Design a protein around this ligand. Structure first.
Ligand SMILES: Cc1cc2nc3c(=O)[nH]c(=O)nc-3n(C[C@H](O)[C@H](O)[C@H](O)COP(=O)(O)OP(=O)(O)OC[C@H]3O[C@@H](n4cnc5c(N)ncnc54)[C@H](O)[C@@H]3O)c2cc1C
Ligand SMILES: CCCCCCCCCCCCCCCCCC(=O)OC[C@H](COP(=O)(O)OCCN)OC(=O)CCCCCCCCCCCCCCCCC
Ligand SMILES: CCCCCCCCCCCCCCCCCC(=O)OC[C@H](COP(=O)(O)OCCN)OC(=O)CCCCCCCCCCCCCCCCC
Ligand SMILES: CCCCCCCCCCCCCCCCCC(=O)OC[C@H](COP(=O)(O)OCCN)OC(=O)CCCCCCCCCCCCCCCCC
Ligand code: HEM
Ligand code: HEM
Ligand code: HEM
Ligand SMILES: COC1=C(OC)C(=O)C(C/C=C(\C)CCC=C(C)C)=C(C)C1=O
Ligand SMILES: COC1=C(OC)C(=O)C(C/C=C(\C)CCC=C(C)C)=C(C)C1=O
Ligand SMILES: COC1=C(OC)C(=O)C(C/C=C(\C)CCC=C(C)C)=C(C)C1=O
Ligand code: SF4
Ligand code: SF4
Ligand code: F3S
Ligand code: F3S
Ligand code: FES
Ligand code: NA
Lengths: 235, 125, 238, 113, 243, 113, 125, 113, 125, 119
């Protein structure tokens, strides 16, 4: 039903990232709002109703401080002529493949695996097999074809790009799920049904460059009211 | 606000000058002449129908009742015409629009209307 | 039961004029799927097919099609309503509006007519409330059946008055939105809108054909909205 | 415009009323001048006067001017003293029909004699 | 120079609720904004919202925002950023009031105030009796929200690129996102939007599973573009399901 | 306005159409009532009926109402099914001329009998 | 954009309810009666011309062909009048504008039109 | 609008002038064709020609078109060469009255013969 | 600014092309025909009055003076009609609006007007 | 002057083909010397109301230009019985035009557009 995470941002929307020491820093120019932005306003379980308020309030905030953020980030150098194609290489590869595999079958297999091993009930070796099958299906997708190659309203190309993004998101989600050794909120494994606070009271972060997992401290210091200390989950 | 507020429009308590009497009577006479046009049109059709129709129209006009109706129509139309010409003069700029001038014109129109009503009554009779 | 369809195909790149291509697709007799499921299963075989589908529930108004003559939503129309004995299942775009691809039509005129009525609230500014404007439950009930428009064009693309004069005629959906914003007790500038749509082409082009209500997916009645607009125009400008 | 009156705006109705009023005053002057100097009135002189082309043409023109003037004035009066919309519309329709019948009857009478 | 380029102060990749909300906020502040979208701005998944906006408007009954903040923190398992939750719960009322002013049809109580329905998970006095601070329309709260946001965008004359597919972000050598290259689905061309603020609002990505309630346009395009650009994705191991 | 129709706006054409339609319904009622009760019809009764002032005045008023109503309706139909400007203008001119000829012929016929 | 895009307007593939049939036939009958007014005006002029003209008009009306044309004109005018009065009732607010009510009114108008057409056919014949 | 001319806007007056001009050209063509082929003209042929229904109806329609066209053209000329308001208004009133009298006299003459 | 500034509008010093002569004469002929319509209407009423009235109208037309007035009216109306049809052709787009084309059309209209004036003069005479 | 709404903004200077540009020749070279308006009787009789040959030329130049997307506004603006239709094809401006222009054709095109729209 819902994606509890996404791009970690601040209270203003600026996406954050750590560099070589785990310290947060704002990615210049990039912002994020809505469900896609992981502002950490819902945690391990989203409360019905808070989604619309999240959207409205945080989007209005991001729009209000855009000038302040552009002033903070300072002037940004232009993009090189090679960056446009370093980005369009995906579309180029998608267009060039006339003999690649079937993308609909790739998506079907990926969805089967993700729904069979990465749902409300997760497991250790089950998630390991899921990770392996995801690796295999990603190596496959790396060759998928584009049968129809029209130019005016070509939905097949949009679907292939959406499938690329879906495979990326599925791999990230599977890695994150297999990383956290705990049972918190929606996340509930079968080999660790105990929600631990000594070492797992923190957010999970996915380094895409190396495809690695890391931990991140949860900001537990509000401004206007004293913070709330963690407690025992109630029925 | 369950019920709307009242409004004091008891015409029995308000007062109007002669200038307002003039306009109200002008409108009344306008409607009266609107109906009198059709009445006179019917009567003239009867008259112009044929000799017997002319005799019938003359007999109708010979009625005391019909005489009264015809005199009233004539008086109303005369009053309307006089007050309308006065209004048109005031509009074009042949009469000052001061309260004094307005009352003067109203009284003059009333006297001329009485004159014309008598003059037409001696005719219908 | 092998389902046989005749779909309206057209590609501006390699083509000269639209055509009707035949297709076959079997389906288990157990379940009864909507037309959107069959379209998806057919595009799985022929990727060249193109059709819009976003919500899959019939709440956003994306796959507005013209099935078997009548306009509707491919996602909320089962195969039974279209499947008949010894008759194909035709899938043609919405009439009137231009065609962009296989089944997608250029809906520019629809949005232009929608915008021409200024579809939004208009409050002067004086007597501002301390908080959100206060309108009683009846003033709110006055708005039901007037703001649920998902903008799927199934109403305007089924009215001959729309086909004959899309640019001038506002259309059933446009008039519905106009009435919704005219009756809302929050905007205090109704006379401006009334003078805006007092043209001999904007509103009075409706002849009570009552095809929009017949095809309305969300069960609305633009006919009554146009009637109320006519009544308000008579009350004011007469 | 109000889409229900025989006018276009304030100036239009003003000028129309004034012109038709001048015309009707001329017609009343003519009619009173005839009725005064006629002395003894019989069918003979009646038909001799209403048989001339000038008299009938003048009566038709006066009927047209009366149509216009009465339409304007009655629309004004109705808009003043009739709040209900359907009642006012029906009354103005009846008035306009009565005036058009006035004109058509004036014709049917003048071309009959 | 071989690809068309469009200059904009900001580029919002997405037309959903938060998307067009932030777009309108930016535009009103005197800043050029290109509001891209894969589908029509009123076809986003947010149209299928029916529960309502949770906020402590105090209309239904008397209460404060810290109760809502405690409820949120407790329901989040103590994982969400407490500062962000506090800020959201404190700004909720004003945001929803400005929304109402925009023209969103809100259910009305007897006294003519916004209606709110008691929804699960809401507690009084930090876990006391039930709360009724769920502001929403009858059954089309998200529908009306998106439609009113689009109406406001139209009123403000926002630059919207309907049915344009965001291909991938574009960063400079320094590492700052210089913009994003996208494709015109209708004609099929490709154009790079250059903006000093590349906001992402693609939305959910539930389509990665065999059964979901999200629209077909929920493919996590934004998360994929970010992972390709080098921005990390947080808390991807927690997805809210429904049995 | 459209500068080519016998109307002023939407409300004007609406009210005019409705009023002339009521008038024409009354005329049709009168004509059908006559034709029904006439029984045997001969030149004698034909002339006796079309010689009355009420009948001829009513026919002329009905012809005027038909003029107005037909002008409005035909302008609508032409604007609906005629895109070319010159062709539509010529067709509407022909229609208006035909209607004015209808009225003038109704006259030339009623004042002839 | 060398050639403009196509537009699916094949009326042979679209479907209309009875309410649209009603309006289309109303417009058709409106044009038919527009021409029938002139036809009947010519015939009435011939009739009222003179006794010999009346005899000629009666002979013309005695034609089977002319009988058919007259019956068709009568039926078209009756249908137009009935459907127009129904439309005016719907406008003023004497009939609900729901699909069910629309179809009901359309069927009632059709039946009354058949009745009036027969009634006028027994007359012309 | 100018509230004093027999028009609504520029396009209205344009189309009206052009249509009435076409009509009046047709009328002039008919009249010249008659006067040319008439050869010897006597009271007999004069009455025989002006006794037909087509001729009288055509003359009345031409008189109406002349009314409209002359009103438009004279309003234009007066607005061009008459700055004073009262004088221009009186002149246009006189012209419109003369044209309405033209039409009424054309009638009174055609239904007389 | 005690007195308003002067304005050079001495038409005796300005010059006009043939195209302006055409329009000025068209307006003159328009007014002339406006009066000629009433003149001819009076004459036709006299004619159609009765046999003696027809004889009187013929005697009036037999006057050299009346002959000249009738010929002038005919020539003015012919010139007006020709120049008006030329203007309408230019409007609709059957004649180029270049100075050369304008002068050509003006000369052709003048020649056709002379022709029609002679043709009508042989008639009135 | 030009009037562009703002939506669908181009990446650079608006793109109009060579024919759309040729549609502008003979309509923007007006040096505004008044030799056209000061030679038209329609101008002498009603300068305040009548727009004049140069004014109508500029109006048509800005109406036909493919860059302004609000032609209906201007068309309604100059649809008065005094603003445009006061031209009787006198053709004196073209006769006196120093820059060899033809305001007569511009006024004719304006009349044609008014007929197409408001008729
Ligand atoms: C069935 C359902 C019911 C729900 N009910 C409720 C409820 O009752 N209460 C509640 O509080 N929440 C509810 N939610 C959750 C909440 O409504 C959603 O999370 C909300 O829609 C999020 O808004 P958004 O703007 O971030 O997403 P969206 O509105 O989907 O915004 C994304 C937009 O960006 C566009 N886009 C996406 N990718 C690209 C790309 N690559 N390039 C260009 N454009 C792109 C999309 O087309 C879309 O217009 C519900 C969610 C679902 C699915
Ligand atoms: C505005 C219209 C102004 C016209 C005013 C109408 C004046 C009416 C005059 C009148 O009352 O006629 C009555 C007349 C009485 O005739 P009698 O008394 O026998 O002697 C006649 C010799 N003087 O009765 C008759 O002899 C019969 C004549 C009937 C007069 C009807 C004329 C109607 C004129 C139409 C007006 C519109
Ligand atoms: C809207 C107008 C509604 C009017 C409807 C017209 C009804 C026509 C009636 C008709 O068909 O008349 C036919 C008639 C046949 O006469 P016959 O069969 O000999 O016997 C007559 C005794 N019943 O033929 C005749 O006898 C000659 C009479 C001709 C009738 C012409 C009437 C035209 C009325 C004008 C309508 C406009
Ligand atoms: C626009 C209207 C166009 C109509 C042009 C009018 C043409 C006038 C013709 C004429 O001058 O008639 C003169 C006529 C002289 O008759 P006479 O010389 O004796 O011999 C006749 C045998 N050819 O004189 C007569 O015989 C008496 C006939 C009088 C003609 C009056 C016709 C008026 C027509 C109305 C026009 C409006
Ligand atoms: C002959 C038949 C006439 C009829 C049926 C008629 C009818 C009417 C009516 C009903 C009104 C409404 C008055 C109001 O609203 O207060 C009116 C107004 C007027 N009438 Fe007449 N009238 C006629 C003749 C005349 C004549 C001959 C004149 C000569 C001056 C005239 C002058 C006026 C004026 C000036 C007004 C408008 C005054 C105002 O609005 O204040 N009327 N007419
Ligand atoms: C007597 C001669 C008549 C003629 C020549 C005539 C002609 C026309 C025409 C051609 C139309 C166009 C219809 C359309 O555009 O769809 C029309 C509309 C109409 N007619 Fe008639 N008609 C006549 C009598 C009547 C009568 C007696 C009525 C009585 C109700 C009537 C009622 C209507 C109505 C209400 C409309 C407008 C309906 C709409 O626009 O949807 N007509 N007329
Ligand atoms: C039959 C009686 C007619 C009368 C009393 C009459 C009167 C007038 C007058 C006074 C004008 C004013 C001209 C101006 O303002 O420059 C005019 C304009 C005009 N007339 Fe006539 N006219 C008549 C017949 C015709 C006919 C038969 C035509 C055939 C084409 C015609 C064509 C025109 C045109 C086209 C105009 C407008 C031209 C322009 O405004 O530049 N007229 N009319
Ligand atoms: C001079 O101004 C006045 C009026 O005119 C605007 C009136 O109306 C009235 C009251 C008269 C009414 C309501 C009935 C009018 C009569 C008819 C026949 C319509 C008064 C006292 C008045 O002083
Ligand atoms: C009820 O609405 C409808 C119309 O009206 C707006 C139509 O026009 C048509 C198609 C008819 C045409 C094009 C010809 C019309 C006939 C004449 C005589 C003008 C249909 C199918 C229709 O359903
Ligand atoms: C072709 O353009 C012209 C006119 O028309 C706009 C004129 O007016 C005049 C001057 C004529 C005047 C003032 C009197 C006009 C005559 C009558 C009978 C009204 C000239 C020189 C002219 O060249
Ligand atoms: S009311 Fe009309 S526009 Fe709205 S969803 Fe229904 S058919 Fe579509
Ligand atoms: S077109 Fe020629 S005469 Fe007219 S204003 Fe321009 S430069 Fe002067
Ligand atoms: S005419 Fe068409 S727009 Fe609606 S009111 Fe009737 S179905
Ligand atoms: S009237 Fe004058 S303004 Fe030009 S078009 Fe003719 S020269
Ligand atoms: S499926 Fe998207 S609108 Fe019906
Ligand atoms: Na999230």
């Amino acid at each position: 039903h819902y994606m509890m995470g996404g791009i970690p941002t601040k209270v203003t929307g600026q996406a954050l990232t750590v560099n070589e020491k785990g310290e947060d820093v704002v990615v210049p120019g990039l912002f994020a709002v809505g469900e896609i932005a992981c502002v950490s306003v819902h945690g391990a379980n989203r409360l019905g109703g808070n989604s619309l308020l999240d959207l409205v309030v945080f989007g209005r905030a991001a729009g209000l401080h855009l000038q302040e953020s552009i002033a903070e980030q300072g002037a940004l150098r232009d993009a090189s002529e090679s960056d446009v194609e370093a980005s369009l290489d995906r579309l180029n590869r998608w267009n060039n493949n006339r003999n690649g595999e079937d993308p609909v079958a790739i998506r079907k297999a990926l969805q089967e695996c993700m729904q069979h091993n990465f749902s409300v009930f997760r497991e250790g070796d089950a998630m390991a097999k899921g990770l392996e099958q995801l690796k295999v299906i990603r190596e496959r997708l790396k060759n998928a074809r584009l049968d129809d190659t029209s130019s005016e309203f070509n939905t097949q190309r949009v679907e292939c790009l959406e499938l690329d993004n879906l495979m990326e998101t599925a791999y990230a989600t599977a890695v994150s799920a297999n990383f956290r050794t705990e049972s918190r909120g929606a996340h509930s494994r079968f080999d660790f049904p105990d929600r631990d606070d000594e070492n797992w009271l923190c957010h999970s972060l996915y380094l895409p460059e190396s495809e690695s997992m890391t931990r991140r401290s949860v900001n537990m210091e509000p401004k206007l009211r004293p913070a709330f200390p963690p407690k025992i989950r109630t029925y | 606000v369950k019920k709307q507020r009242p409004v004091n429009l008891d015409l029995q308590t308000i007062r109007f000058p002669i200038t307002a009497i003039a306009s109200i009577l002008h409108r009344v006479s306008g409607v009266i002449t609107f109906v009198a046009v059709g009445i006179l049109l019917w009567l003239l059709g009867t008259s112009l129908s044929s000799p017997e129709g002319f005799e019938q129209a003359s007999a109708i006009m010979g009625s005391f009742f019909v005489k009264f109706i015809m005199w009233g129509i004539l008086t109303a139309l005369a009053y309307h015409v006089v007050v309308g010409i006065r209004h048109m003069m005031m509009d074009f700029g042949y009469l000052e629009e001061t309260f004094e001038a307005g009352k003067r014109s109203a009284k003059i129109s009333f006297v001329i209307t009485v004159v014309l009503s008598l003059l037409a009554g001696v005719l219908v009779w | 039961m092998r389902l046989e369809f005749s779909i309206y195909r057209y590609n501006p790149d390699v083509d000269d004029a639209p055509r009707m291509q035949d297709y076959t697709l079997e389906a288990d007799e157990g379940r009864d799927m909507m037309l959107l499921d069959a379209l998806i299963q057919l595009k799985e075989k022929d990727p060249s097919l193109s059709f819009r589908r976003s919500c899959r529930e019939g709440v956003c108004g994306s796959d507005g099609l013209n099935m078997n003559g009548k306009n509707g939503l491919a996602c909320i129309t089962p195969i039974s309503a279209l499947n008949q004995p010894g008759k194909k299942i035709v899938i043609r775009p919405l009439p009137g509006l231009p065609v962009i691809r296989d089944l997608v039509v250029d809906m520019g005129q629809f949005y232009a007519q929608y915008e021409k009525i200024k579809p939004y609230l208009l409050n002067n500014g004086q007597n501002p409330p301390a908080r959100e404007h206060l309108q009683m439950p009846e003033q709110r009930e006055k708005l039901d059946g007037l703001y649920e428009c998902i903008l799927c064009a199934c109403c305007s693309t089924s009215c001959p008055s729309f086909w004959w004069n899309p640019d001038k005629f506002i259309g059933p959906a446009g008039l519905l939105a106009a009435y919704r914003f005219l009756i809302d007790s929050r905007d205090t500038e109704t006379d401006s809108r009334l003078d805006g749509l007092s043209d001999a082409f904007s509103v009075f082009r409706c002849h009570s054909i009552m095809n929009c209500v017949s095809v309305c997916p969300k069960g609305l009645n633009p006919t009554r909205a146009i009637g109320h607009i006519k009544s308000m125009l008579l009350q004011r400008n007469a | 415009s109000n889409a229900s009156a025989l006018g276009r705006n304030g100036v239009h109705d003003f000028i129309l009323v004034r012109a038709t009023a001048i015309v009707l005053t001329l017609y009343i002057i003519y009619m009173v001048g005839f009725f005064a100097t006629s002395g003894e009135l019989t069918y003979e002189v009646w038909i001799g006067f209403f048989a001339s082309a000038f008299t009938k043409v003048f009566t038709l023109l006066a009927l047209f001017s009366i149509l216009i003037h009465a339409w304007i004035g009655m629309w004004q009066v109705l808009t003043d003293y009739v709040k209900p919309l359907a009642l006012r519309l029906m009354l103005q329709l009846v008035i306009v029909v009565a005036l058009v019948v006035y004109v058509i009857y004036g014709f049917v009478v003048v071309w009959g004699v | 120079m071989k690809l068309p380029v469009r200059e904009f102060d900001a580029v919002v990749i997405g037309a959903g609720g938060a998307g067009m909300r932030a777009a309108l906020q930016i535009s009103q502040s005197g800043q050029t904004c290109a509001l891209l979208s894969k589908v029509f701005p009123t076809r986003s998944h947010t149209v299928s919202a029916q529960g309502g906006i949770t906020v402590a408007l105090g209309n239904t009954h008397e209460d404060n925002w810290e109760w809502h903040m405690y409820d949120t923190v407790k329901g989040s398992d103590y994982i969400g950023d407490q500062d962000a939750i506090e800020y959201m719960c404190k700004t909720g009322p004003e945001a929803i009031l400005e929304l109402e002013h925009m023209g969103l049809p809100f259910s009305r109580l007897d006294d003519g105030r916004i209606y709110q329905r008691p929804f699960g998970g809401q507690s009084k006095n930090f876990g006391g009796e039930q709360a009724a601070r769920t502001a929403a329309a009858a059954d089309r709260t998200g529908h009306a929200l998106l439609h009113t946001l689009y109406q406001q965008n139209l009123k403000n004359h926002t630059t919207i690129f309907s049915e344009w597919y965001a291909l991938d972000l574009v960063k400079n050598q320094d590492g700052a996102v210089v913009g994003c290259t996208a494709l015109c689905i209708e004609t099929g061309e490709v154009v790079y939007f250059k903006a000093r603020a590349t906001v992402l609002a693609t939305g959910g990505a539930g389509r990665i599973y065999q059964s979901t309630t999200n629209a077909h346009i929920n493919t996590g395009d934004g998360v994929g573009m970010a992972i390709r650009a080098g921005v990390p994705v947080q808390d991807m191991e927690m997805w809210q399901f429904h049995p």
